[PDB]
Amino acid sequence: KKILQANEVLEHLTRIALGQEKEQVLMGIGKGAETKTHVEVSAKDRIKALELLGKA
Amino acid sequence: KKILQANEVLEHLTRIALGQEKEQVLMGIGKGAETKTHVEVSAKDRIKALELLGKA
Amino acid sequence: NEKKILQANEVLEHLTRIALGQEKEQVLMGIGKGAETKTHVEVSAKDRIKALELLGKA
Amino acid sequence: KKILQANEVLEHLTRIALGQEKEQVLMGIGKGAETKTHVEVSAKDRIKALELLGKA
Amino acid sequence: KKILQANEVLEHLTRIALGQEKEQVLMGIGKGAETKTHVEVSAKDRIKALELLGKA
Amino acid sequence: NEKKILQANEVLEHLTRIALGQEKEQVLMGIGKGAETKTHVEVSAKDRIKALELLGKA
Amino acid sequence: EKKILQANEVLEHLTRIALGQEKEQVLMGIGKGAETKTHVEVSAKDRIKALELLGKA
Amino acid sequence: EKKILQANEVLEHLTRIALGQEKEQVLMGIGKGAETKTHVEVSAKDRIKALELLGKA
Amino acid sequence: EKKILQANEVLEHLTRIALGQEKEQVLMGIGKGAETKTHVEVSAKDRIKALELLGKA
């Protein structure tokens, strides 16, 4: 049960901040039906990542 | 009786942060009907786990 | 029980059940045409991460 | 007029935390119509009750 | 005309926590139409009242 | 010209009106088929409790 | 260098908001999923924040 | 070479926002599930946030 | 072992955001519940968060 170390944490946040990452969400396909799909990680999230990298 | 220990907490946080995990959500299947489904844990929740991990 | 108070360890055991994915919550699910029904879902990733946080501060 | 004291506050939070409480919500009954009903208090709200009991 | 002092505040918060209060919300009545009505105060709000009472 | 600045007791008078359930806010309300109108409803519980909290702190 | 609001001008603005004077632009339904831009009174929540800022001043 | 917005510059921008000079792109309903991009004034909550930050300067 | 953004890199990225040079991907209604992916300007809320941080630096 490995544990992510502080520098591996800064790496993962860097990828997010650099627009490199995606998240799964629900997307309308029509008449109420939805499908799973991947979208870029949002501005809000990318900013939080940027905030943390700055506190490093 | 079980109380998750501090190291075990980091382990669990690590599995989330590394995109290994899912949550149960509702998804539309047509005309107002929904199904229970599993999706990846969001960027938002991953970044929080990542934040907690960098403060350890 | 009308004056039962959860003690510190009880709180941590309860958070541990949440954190470990052993708990549910009652939500409203759509069953067609605007109609909803009560159902139980796994506690969310967000709520589990709060429990984890809390267990990590202990 | 009554003022809840600390011990009563913790008793009330305890029932919440233990999943013994309900809240009134709006539930869809068809074609935009809704009705009042009671649901279990949410995980979020329970978890806040625990955090508060953890701090006493 | 009036300013609430701290003990009056607690009195009002107590009513809320004890579940003696309501709030006005919009409820659907069908075909997009909504109607004003009252519901019990939510658990989130009741918990906040509790939190303040226990910190008094 | 000197513009108005709410003074200490005036803020408390306003929060008190809110807390007491004397005030309203403007919101959009469905009237049929996706169309909405503007109306007033009572300030909500969350907002009243925030007013109360600020009153307690003063 | 441009225009920067001073500490007083901030309070003046906040007071107009707290006093129910201001509005904000929102989207309103006009039917069948279609919406239009309209203005509405600044909300209770936003007025309470303003009151707060004025209270801490 | 690359730009870093300095403290004074930030206050100028926040001031434009607090005054009601700025807008944001949002999705608006146009009927039957269709939305379109359009601009609206920056909301009250966001303006009050700019006001808070300027107030603390 | 892998790339980590340094402080000035962070400020540069935040500056792009505050300045309204950046977008985000979202889902938009195209009809009858159908959605498609598309890019929108970064919202005011987020631009003000970037502004705040820059002010802090």
Side-chain angles (χ1 to χ4, degrees), chain A:
Chain A
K1 310 189 181 175
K2 74 191 66 205
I3 300 169
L4 276 198
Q5 314 280 119
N7 267 3
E8 184 149 12
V9 168
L10 294 177
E11 295 169 354
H12 278 98
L13 290 161
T14 293
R15 297 184 64 256
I16 291 172
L18 286 183
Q20 293 177 323
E21 189 75 6
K22 311 280 187 292
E23 53 165 14
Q24 200 176 43
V25 305
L26 302 186
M27 171 171 88
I29 58 175
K31 308 164 166 181
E34 307 186 312
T35 192
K36 300 177 192 154
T37 199
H38 288 92
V39 301
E40 296 168 19
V41 176
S42 70
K44 288 190 285 312
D45 285 341
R46 292 194 317 257
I47 293 160
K48 178 63 173 180
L50 275 171
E51 186 179 9
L52 299 164
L53 288 159
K55 299 199 294 200

Side-chain angles (χ1 to χ4, degrees), chain F:
Chain F
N1 173 41
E2 279 169 47
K3 295 176 183 184
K4 179 168 177 73
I5 296 176
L6 272 190
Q7 305 301 138
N9 64 47
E10 295 178 276
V11 154
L12 297 174
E13 284 165 354
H14 284 268
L15 296 168
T16 283
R17 294 171 187 102
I18 295 177
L20 280 62
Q22 297 171 18
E23 307 295 310
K24 307 289 289 175
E25 65 177 351
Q26 196 184 51
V27 307
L28 304 173
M29 183 177 65
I31 54 173
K33 301 196 164 184
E36 289 172 341
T37 191
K38 293 157 191 176
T39 205
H40 296 85
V41 297
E42 314 171 20
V43 173
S44 76
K46 190 198 185 179
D47 287 324
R48 291 194 306 267
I49 297 157
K50 179 76 205 209
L52 285 173
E53 171 169 31
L54 297 162
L55 292 156
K57 284 197 174 184

Side-chain angles (χ1 to χ4, degrees), chain G residues 18-54:
Chain G
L19 282 48
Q21 304 185 352
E22 302 304 303
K23 287 180 195 172
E24 49 167 22
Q25 196 178 226
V26 299
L27 308 170
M28 187 178 66
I30 63 174
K32 304 291 170 174
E35 300 167 345
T36 198
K37 292 167 193 185
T38 196
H39 291 71
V40 286
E41 299 175 10
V42 164
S43 81
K45 182 178 165 162
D46 281 336
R47 294 200 310 280
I48 285 159
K49 186 51 175 185
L51 281 163
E52 184 174 14
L53 288 164
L54 288 157

Side-chain angles (χ1 to χ4, degrees), chain I residues 30-45:
Chain I
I30 70 172
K32 301 288 188 87
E35 291 177 325
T36 194
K37 300 177 184 159
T38 192
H39 282 87
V40 294
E41 299 176 28
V42 170
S43 72
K45 285 181 305 303

Side-chain angles (χ1 to χ4, degrees), chain B residues 4 13 26 31-32 36-38 41 43 46-48:
Chain B
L4 275 189
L13 288 173
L26 302 180
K31 308 311 204 165
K36 292 164 191 198
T37 204
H38 283 94
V41 60
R46 296 205 306 279
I47 292 169
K48 184 70 169 166

Side-chain angles (χ1 to χ4, degrees), chain A residues 31-33, chain B residues 26-36, chain C residues 28-38, chain D residues 27-34:
Chain A
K31 308 164 166 181
Chain B
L26 302 180
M27 177 172 71
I29 63 164
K31 308 311 204 165
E34 296 187 305
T35 187
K36 292 164 191 198
Chain C
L28 298 172
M29 185 182 51
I31 77 180
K33 306 187 164 175
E36 284 176 329
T37 197
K38 291 170 195 171
Chain D
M27 177 171 67
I29 59 173
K31 289 167 152 269
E34 301 168 319

